Swiss-Prot record, chains A, D:
Interacts with capsid protein VP0, and capsid protein VP3 to form heterotrimeric protomers. Five protomers subsequently associate to form pentamers which serve as building blocks for the capsid. Interacts with capsid protein VP2, capsid protein VP3 and capsid protein VP4 following cleavage of capsid protein VP0. Interacts with human PVR. This is Capsid protein VP1. Disulfide bonds: none annotated. Forms an icosahedral capsid of pseudo T=3 symmetry with capsid proteins VP2 and VP3. The capsid is 300 Angstroms in diameter, composed of 60 copies of each capsid protein and enclosing the viral positive strand RNA genome. Capsid protein VP1 mainly forms the vertices of the capsid. Capsid protein VP1 interacts with host cell receptor PVR to provide virion attachment to target host epithelial cells.
Length: 201, 238, 223, 201, 223, 60
């Protein structure tokens, strides 16, 4: 086991350390069947690293960051009922709302049609979808820590991901889950800090 | 011709190094710079410990099935080599195993001397059992591993894939094997792990005229070569 | 068109993929970067920083400020070591949570040297000698000052130099008690001039060297 | 039949001798239907040559080895029941846990999300999945024989393959089998040995 | 994008594929190789090693040490051969399990020469002559010493040379008794000086030559 | 990756196809040819040979 090893630091680079695909959310949507459907007809998730402890910790090693963002969507559906479910292949709208732009509030909201918001139209059964958002920060680096206040009497916007099913009047309820795999790319970091414990994570 | 070889305070006599084998045609060598590191740090005591050590002789008979030794194990009580093999934590060494064998012209038989890398024997699950030390173990014809299988379920006729020599008494009565350091690592623990294993099996059995000496001596003389270890090497900064 | 043949591994998503991807904001002009001071290009840069060892992880000292101070005092000449620190930077609860150890927890294999640095935080008047011994791996730690002296050691004169550095070389991955020891003994008891306190504290800091190397990331951080 | 043949040793090379695809395991998983499911929801297999006699024998011709590893996953599912089974196309997570890394213990274990472990997300019906693991050995060669002990009073880690189905609440039980086809690549070998019999194989 | 046309053989997995594949550990730095002594670049290198023939596969000798020793003794001058070995290195239970034969079992076609080497393991005082005959393929083996002598043979004087080598050339694949024979006869009976034993043993070794060639791998190893 | 557009005639098997194909025995070394006498390069070579006409195809 005790092996002679030459100098090798390539895998401790910032890119090697950070640029690794990792699921950051599991969005869920149900097919637009007019049966009992709520909330359910569309999913929304504000992009954030603060919901997964691995990426959060690795970033909070530092104060400031910059990185592009390779999102990859793994969709998985199935019939909700014992019902002998027959359903033509569904299409999923995966909309990326850029920072500081309106969010969908309904399945039929105007935002879904908006030209601003880039949308993927993903046909189920095909390869997982993918987009690469660039550094969309207002400042010149994503700040994980911000000593300061909004008003004088922390948080940074990466965008929003909204998802719906485009197929309209489906007879059989098809539940679907979209695992979002985020992979930071072209990562730069500044001003290292101590890691936290695994305490408030 | 009779060549008398001295290593340190130790002298042996060799009839001739006429047929002295080098496993894989690779001579023992220190850990080269391309595979070394100034931060994984070796030292070279190949001054004193690297001498001839002559194990206690074994007696070949008509009934003998074979003998075996492990390395560096056999030399774990052999003076400075045995000391270094316990003081140091990591070590590497080649060997020169000169199996001399003393017989008349009226004895007959043949030995196969085989040097085996990673000679894992079996009837194995025990250190003391798998490492008999200086005296080595012996084979069988049915723990002690099996003659024709080398212990490792392995027809002895194919054993000649290993580095080897044949001591056929009518011709040569001695064999030499120059073993380089062979391991998956450049350096490793000597006490926990035996790299080489010597196995001497009578291919042709001993036989002799009427009232000759009934049991002849096989003598092993093992010389460590390019013995090098760790690594006490500390830097104290001002 | 061009005749092609889809191969295995087509239409799969390997998380370790490195392909191109279509940008969602191609017409967007990205906020250009500034030269923020303090850019890190390799995580080892953080392991190379000397960070204080929490020696005393007792039931009461631990998770306090006192867990970082090895107290020297006046008491009978027992050659028991002041401290005996095992050099398992990944699994040793003292070195484990150092910055070095925090980074090493992210990797599976690693090798290099560790520089330890003991800092005396007593009086300018205090005088004495300590024996900083290094036990290589496979050797059990020394229990008495003579055993330590006959091995590898540094006699640290407190009155002359307030710190002592020691670079240990043969540090490598545990698996997946060995590594060696850094021990500290009283060579002499500490001499003070007057009512000066006879209770000092030594701190300790550890870091990797520039040579140090890690590989095969093993993020294991869950709840 | 008795043909004059010129010198030809290309097919007796180490690469030609070893670099040949061969099934090394048949993992099995059942769909995460909350019907009666055990153990069944995920498969785990420690990579090893010692479970297939052909590769084992060919390797145990030698003492030491090095080789990359082209794994190829042939997935085959079917409905477990006579039930008129309707099921939207399933996705399979094929995770490769590198050597010396934690193994999954549950379907919902944290390891499945870990960024360290590379995972394939394979959509059923598509081409068989494939990855190439490199030489992941701690030492400088895979040792088939190791005369020596762990402690003083044989085995080498290639990784683990874990598999699960990502689709969550399936009504119909779908049994699935993933045949793993290993193909050593860039093989080097050292210190030949006699072959064993076919006795303890 | 680029217009393409999926061809037949798309999305199939041919086990004999040789394409590229995405690496699962691209950022991993592989443990670099050392120069381990004893690297093999071709399996024929192992067939080129002279390995001992198990002549006597009798019900009792087989799977023992005695299955490798052809015993010479003193008995009536019957010109029956000491041994008659058929040169079917793939299917002959003697040559089958030699290293040569073990490798040949992995292949379907093969051709080249085999060097056999008989080694006398008697006394330095023993004297005599043996006739090592080679019968080419298609010729039934010789049954008497004269038939052997009038063919291709070597008279091996034991007292002068302890071994005899014989390179047979026309060895080729069985199919998918022929090949020839190497026989050994007593030319003279063995002469010993005194009470020296009149029971010796000859060993035999076989190997392929550098010329030897194999092709079309046929691993057939199951349980 | 490289953006492509599958065209018509994709995933069809035209028996008159002439594409490349993956070899099943890539590591196999083929038995090399000899100069057998009598090689034909075109079937017309056989039509160029004078062959006897069966004139009388009567019942007998």
């Amino acid at each position: 086991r005790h092996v002679v090893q030459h100098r090798s630091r390539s895998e401790s680079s910032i890119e090697s350390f950070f640029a690794r695909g990792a699921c950051v959310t599991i969005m869920t949507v149900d097919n637009p069947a007019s049966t009992t459907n709520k909330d359910k007809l569309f999913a929304v998730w504000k992009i954030t690293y603060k919901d997964t402890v691995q990426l959060r910790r690795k970033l909070e090693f530092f104060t400031y960051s910059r990185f592009d963002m390779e999102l990859t969507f793994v969709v998985t559906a199935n019939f909700t009922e014992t019902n002998n479910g027959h359903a033509l292949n569904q299409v999923y709208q995966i909309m990326y709302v850029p920072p500081g732009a309106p969010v969908p509030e309904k399945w039929d909201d105007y935002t879904w049609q908006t030209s601003s918001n880039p949308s993927i139209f993903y046909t189920y059964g095909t390869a997982p979808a993918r987009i690469s958002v660039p550094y969309v920060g207002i400042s010149n680096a994503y700040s994980h820590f911000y000593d300061g206040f909004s008003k004088v009497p922390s948080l940074n916007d990466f965008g929003i991901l909204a998802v719906r099913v485009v197929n309209d009047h489906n007879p059989t309820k098809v539940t679907s889950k979209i695992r979002v795999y985020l992979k930071p790319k072209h990562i730069r970091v500044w001003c290292p800090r101590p890691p936290r414990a695994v305490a408030y994570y | 011709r009779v060549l008398q070889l001295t290593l340190g305070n130790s002298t042996i006599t060799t009839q001739e190094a006429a047929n002295s084998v080098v496993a894989y045609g690779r001579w023992p060598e220190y850990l080269r710079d391309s595979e070394a590191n100034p931060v994984d740090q070796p030292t070279e005591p190949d001054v004193a410990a690297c001498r001839f050590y002559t194990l206690d002789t074994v007696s070949w008979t008509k009934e003998s099935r074979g003998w075996w030794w492990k390395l560096p194990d056999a030399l774990r009580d052999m003076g400075l080599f045995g000391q270094n093999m316990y003081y140091h934590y990591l070590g590497r060494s080649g060997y020169t195993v000169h199996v001399q064998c003393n017989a008349s012209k009226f004895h007959q038989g043949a030995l196969g001397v085989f040097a085996v890398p990673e000679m894992c024997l079996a009837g194995h699950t025990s250190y003391q059992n798998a490492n008999p030390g200086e005296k080595g173990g012996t084979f069988t014809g049915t723990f002690c591993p099996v003659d024709y299988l080398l212990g490792n379920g392995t027809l002895l006729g194919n054993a000649f894939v290993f580095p080897h020599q044949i001591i056929n008494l009518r011709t040569n009565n001695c064999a030499t094997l120059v073993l380089p350091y062979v391991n998956s690592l450049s350096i490793d623990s000597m006490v926990k792990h035996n790299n080489w294993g010597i196995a001497i099996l009578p291919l042709a059995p001993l036989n002799f005229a009427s009232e000759s000496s009934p049991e002849i001596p096989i003598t092993l003389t093992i010389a460590p070569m390019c013995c090098e270890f760790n690594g006490l090497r500390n830097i104290t900064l001002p | 068109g061009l005749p092609v043949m889809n191969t295995p591994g087509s239409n799969q998503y390997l998380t370790a993929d490195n392909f191109q991807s279509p940008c969602a904001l191609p017409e967007f002009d990205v906020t250009p970067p500034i030269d923020i001071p303090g850019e890190v290009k390799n995580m080892m840069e953080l392991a190379e920083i000397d960070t204080m060892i929490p020696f005393d992880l007792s039931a009461t000292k631990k998770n306090t400020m006192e867990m970082y101070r090895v107290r020297l005092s006046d008491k009978p000449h027992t050659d028991d070591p002041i401290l005996c620190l095992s050099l398992s930077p990944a699994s040793d609860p003292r070195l484990s949570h150092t910055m070095l150890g925090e980074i090493l927890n992210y990797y599976t294999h690693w090798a290099g040297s560790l520089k330890f640095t003991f800092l005396f935080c007593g009086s300018m008047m205090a005088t004495g000698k300590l024996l900083v011994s290094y036990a290589p791996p496979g050797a059990d730690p020394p229990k008495k000052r003579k055993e330590a002296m006959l091995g590898t050691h540094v006699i640290w004169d407190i009155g002359l130099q307030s710190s002592c550095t020691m670079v240990v070389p043969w540090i490598s991955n545990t698996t997946y008690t060995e590594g060696g020891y850094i021990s500290v003994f009283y060579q002499t008891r500490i001499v003070v001039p007057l009512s000066t306190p006879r209770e000092m504290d030594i701190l300790g800091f550890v870091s990797a060297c520039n040579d140090f190397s890690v590989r095969l990331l093993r993020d294991t951080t869950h709840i």
